[PDB]
Amino acid sequence: MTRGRVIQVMGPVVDVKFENGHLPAIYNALKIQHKARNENEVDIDLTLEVALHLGDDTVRTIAMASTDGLIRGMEVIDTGAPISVPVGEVTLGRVFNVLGEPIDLEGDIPADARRDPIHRPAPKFEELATEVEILETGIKVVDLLAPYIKGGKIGLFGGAGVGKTVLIQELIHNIAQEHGGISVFAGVGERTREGNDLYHEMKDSGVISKTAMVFGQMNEPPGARMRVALTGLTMAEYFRDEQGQDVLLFIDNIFRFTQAGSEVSALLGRMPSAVGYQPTLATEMGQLQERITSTAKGSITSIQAIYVPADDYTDPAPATTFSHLDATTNLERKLAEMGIYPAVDPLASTSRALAPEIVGEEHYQVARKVQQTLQRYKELQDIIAILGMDELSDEDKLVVHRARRIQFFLSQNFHVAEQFTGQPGSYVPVKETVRGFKEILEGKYDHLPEDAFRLVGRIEEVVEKAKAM
Amino acid sequence: TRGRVIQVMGPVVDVKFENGHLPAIYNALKIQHKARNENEVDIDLTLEVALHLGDDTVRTIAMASTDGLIRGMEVIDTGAPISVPVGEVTLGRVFNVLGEPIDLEGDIPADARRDPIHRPAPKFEELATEVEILETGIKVVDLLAPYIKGGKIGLFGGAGVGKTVLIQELIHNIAQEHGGISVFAGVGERTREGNDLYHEMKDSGVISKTAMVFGQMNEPPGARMRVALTGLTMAEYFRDEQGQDVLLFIDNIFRFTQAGSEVSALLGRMPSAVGYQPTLATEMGQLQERITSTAKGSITSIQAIYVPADDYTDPAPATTFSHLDATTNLERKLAEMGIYPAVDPLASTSRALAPEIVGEEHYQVARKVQQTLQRYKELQDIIAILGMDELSDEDKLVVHRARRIQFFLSQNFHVAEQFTGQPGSYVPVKETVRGFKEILEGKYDHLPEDAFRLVGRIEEVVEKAKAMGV
Amino acid sequence: MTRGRVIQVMGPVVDVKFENGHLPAIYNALKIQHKARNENEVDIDLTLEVALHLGDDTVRTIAMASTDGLIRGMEVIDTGAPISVPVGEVTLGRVFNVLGEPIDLEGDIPADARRDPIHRPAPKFEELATEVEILETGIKVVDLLAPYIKGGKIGLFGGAGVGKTVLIQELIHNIAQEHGGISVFAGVGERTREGNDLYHEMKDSGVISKTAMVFGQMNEPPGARMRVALTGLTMAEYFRDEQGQDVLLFIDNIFRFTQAGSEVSALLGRMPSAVGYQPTLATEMGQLQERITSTAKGSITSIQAIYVPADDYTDPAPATTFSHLDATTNLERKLAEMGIYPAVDPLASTSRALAPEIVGEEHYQVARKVQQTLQRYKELQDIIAILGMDELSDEDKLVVHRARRIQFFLSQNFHVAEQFTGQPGSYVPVKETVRGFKEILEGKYDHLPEDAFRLVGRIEEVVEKAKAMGV
Amino acid sequence: GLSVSRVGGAAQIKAMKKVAGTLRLDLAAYRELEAFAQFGSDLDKATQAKLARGARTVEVLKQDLHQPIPVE
Amino acid sequence: LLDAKASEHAARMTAMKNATDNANELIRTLTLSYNRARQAAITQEITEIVAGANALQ
Amino acid sequence: GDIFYLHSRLLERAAKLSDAKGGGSLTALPFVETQAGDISAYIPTNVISITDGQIFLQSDLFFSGVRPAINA
Ligand SMILES: Nc1ncnc2c1ncn2[C@@H]1O[C@H](COP(=O)(O)OP(=O)(O)O)[C@@H](O)[C@H]1O
């Protein structure tokens, strides 16, 4: 029989003792439902993740909630599996904690629903996809200068008023519109009021009916914040595997995953690794980000926010995330104050997929000419500042006259911004933005005014916006 | 009710009493052992209980050296913590950590009153409601960094600057114009300097009002931990019973923290960040929250601080600076320039320099003094390299007034009468605010650059200037 | 008849338990010879040396080879002595492993040969010899600024891939033929291919048969590498004691001795010392390094390469060995990236023989004025880095203009570096490098370009290289 | 400059005291004004006079090895 | 002389621009060294703290 | 290990409630003392990463006379 006794409680770490031979495996879930039998006790509903086997039939667990009220000798349910989290169409449009329970007040998920284990081994070498194919977003700065990958890890660099949530939300809308997939937002260790604001933005933008939210936030123990990306990822894996579609998987502040792992390691009593990180930093990051892959069934492509502490890109928590990333989309405050949406910095944003053997020769040459034109414009900024707009040369005036048209053609009208600006917003396929930037580079649209290029989708649409102005 | 020595581990001795007769924590335990043969040494210790271990076992800290201890010596329980003699008896005397006279003037009889070292801090309902200012009669102190009555002052000063002269004139001025006893406590620094300080007490004559306690670097770290508490126990008698405004000098309060860091590693405690003990700020506050101004008395405290390697992010200066109310940073540039006391006017700050505490006129006068001295400090490379002639006037007036301000900041001390013959002065705060206001108005710009050197008030400036023929 | 069982096997470290009152002393050698009774066993031929005593008749040992295959309960034979190493005239021209066994495939040393024990106490106070005289090397930095001593300890501090094996081979090429006495090479934790190359150039240059070689290369478990240098050292000190011979001793990476001690120290039950090193980081190296001495019977002039981890000279294993050496040359990666070979830091490299009473007066004034101009140029580095050469006050321009020339005339072409560049290499006597640096300091060669001074033996070759450049 | 003596002055004899008191001033002035003579713009005649005073002070304070000087 | 004064002020402008560029390159190499040293300081201090904790058991 | 958890379960109790829960609010103002103005320490980076923005009070602005010394 799998009924155990609580031996030690010390903070978020609980030691539970079972009988011999009936020990729970590592990473299994252990429920404690204890109703108070008198006035000297506290009602407790609390689950535990098994972390070690200490010997003498004792098991060291980590806690998912507050351990206050626990008594040595309180009996523990062994569930016989890890944290089983509901999957399927019942999760789309719902907000969840790390246990797969609704934070929302809409209703409870029934007991007959399918629940997939939170800890799964990564898909094998024989199951992965051999070819690197491009996840087409319809956002021109993304799919022209830092192209995404089905099965790719992408770093959002920005936050605090540069349009990160709008970019996230437009990615959900475009992928669930054109590619037919869904999205999963996993808010790992990020504060409660930003989760509330993000919930109400996706509520009043219609985006939420095609996404599933998982919030494990700051007020929760470190074992609860560490398993958030895994319980959002096991929701993304249902639609990768059983449905066979291309899924987004947002992890807001992936650095909170690493530091929650460091806190669980410091509670478990392990000797610290380089700096303040756990010894298993690369192994925990690998067990996270090797399930975000493209198989023959579908894909999971993850857009992730990275904190980069101490402005240090060589700190081990940035340095082990960057070994899994494939693209970076630097969001800039200067492009947001200029009137360019999305605020993706075109020169700072790089991608591994921007290569002729992956996307093609035409896209590569157009994208590199756009990058060289914008780099030379940024170099000529100081000459225009100290010398004036005129009298530089003819070629410098021509490259400014093309580069400013380019840097305003990068912005789009979003479908999510339709509720604020009234214009419907556009999905721009990648052949049309390659053709549009090639025609801007060849001088086909020098005679049009440059404020027609701002916030418009295609190149025919800037033809009609210039003839309407 | 005797106990035997289990372990001797450096300064740390484990003692096992009988069951049910354990001593309370912080009690003093004594080992008077006579050598039974030629293979033993006469030992005489006072052990202080620090912890309680498992099976009737007590872990103690030795106030003296543990060399010569045998596992099995009988240990005597005093039934009380380290009882230190207090009162009028302690004035003019140098004491040990255990409250025993180091000097050869005798010993204190057994019928005298002895108070325990370890006492709780005064309660919230017993403290003073308004901030009062302890008036020292020193113009740098009373103008630019005022000492609050019951607060804590940091001295930043090495040697050759006049730290000891400043200490003994604070003793003189408080015992003159306030009737307040001073108590010196030398916590683990430079037995040579403690001897020099004691003979400067004997020469200056401020030994008759000072009780002194020395446990220096030559002593094990429990003694250096408990020195400041012994001196504070002596000062709390005068505060509680006599109702006086008492000074309490702790020389190198940093050694109080590092003695705890030396003890705690041997007690069996896990190390805190930067190698310090885990109970750093707790045993710092259990010292310094006893230094308060209650309703009936006051203890103000001037505390020398040796910041190790000038690292102000170190945890022991951090926990020391969290309690301070003012600094008086002594600099050798002003001491070699001739300005005594050599207090840096711009670096020495205070919490009291605020218009609710000092008034509005004092605040604006001291603020304009700080502004013109900052403007004179940021012209020093220009004056030293380019010269006075290239100084672009409306700055030459600034250097003209700032020299006269920084020489008027120096006093003739009562202590330095024996070295110069000049009798010394006690300058109230209203007269020094009026004097610096009259210098800032430009009333005394016609006077020479000297005659501000080593004078008390502003009428002494014009009498010294007409004594030189001006 | 008293043998012991294996109790614990933890990496390189084996616990052996003997009977009561029959346990060995510290440092004695223990042999494991097992016969592999069934399919589940492996033949073993191990030597263990005692390191500690643990109580309950158990003994904490360090293995000299790999412990893969040891079973608990395996029987251990005590030998009653430390690791005995054969020595005499029979070790000249032979190559040995850490147990003193020949590995050059030329035969086996007989059992009746003389075997000195490895572990002996250091030479005392009254036995040492403190004469100081210059060992001439033909290297301009070494002859000018840090003169080596014939009979003293010499250290080649450097990072990884900075030039100290090239410098140890250049000193072998310049000294070992001219020496006329026995050489000993101890290879502690260097490359195994550098032991093959060095053996074959000893065979080609005839320095073998007056050379005894011992290799304990970086493939070996750390119990070997803690004892390699002691085997080479007992071979050298036989010659200087029993024969009174002059002995050259070469150790490439004596850092690997202390690193191999650090690899075993955690398993021996010790608390971590400074950084990751043993607590005994100074006495384990002092009991080795202070046996490498010149006494009244003979002298050992020992030239030792010393690795510096992560280019950190403040690390405890490079820091605690500066106090052992008479002359040092500190190699810099910053100079090796400038093309300056040997990349000897001219300021940080010192000697006990740069005194006016030893090298003479003129040598000393030229050396100190070279160091003074290089120190003034190092002081001017920041002004040159930000404001450039333009603001220096016309004597500082002359300091920089001469110090570039001095810094490049410290670099030299080697005979050993002919395989790197094709340039044949030079041997500069002490009088000619003092004359060349004196003529650079006098202003005689300010008109020549500064790239004409790189990798050049004497100062007439500076003249002819500038002539070929077109000045 | 950085080397401190804490007893200092009470250690010295009176003849060393009278003249070391101005040696220290001359050398501290040289240490302060040598910083403004590294590059740039040619300090005036009084500053160069005390730079020459300080450079001769530095040349006085040098010695050689194992030959001490008596106090006189 | 007017042409020479114009070229003087232009040369001082260019010299101070090059000085700011050299100073900023020194800033970025020193912040690389600062990041390496703060990393080594953090790992060295926590190795000391956990060694002192493991010493007790 | 739970020193971030310590401040986070404190500072996530400061909330503007919804109008269904009553409409009340708890606004918090934590303070963090720094030594010589380094915010790259451990408890400053934790509480900066928890709270909803910050207010810097520099000692350079306080010394120069800007009171309150809020670095904007
Ligand atoms: N005198 C020299 N001339 C030219 N190149 C050299 C010289 N000394 C060293 N080098 C270069 O530096 C490298 C240092 O190699 P080596 O000395 O064998 O390694 P380590 O310094 O780690 O022992 C060599 O590969 C060589 O290319």
Ligand SMILES: [Mg+2]
């Ligand atoms: Mg090498």
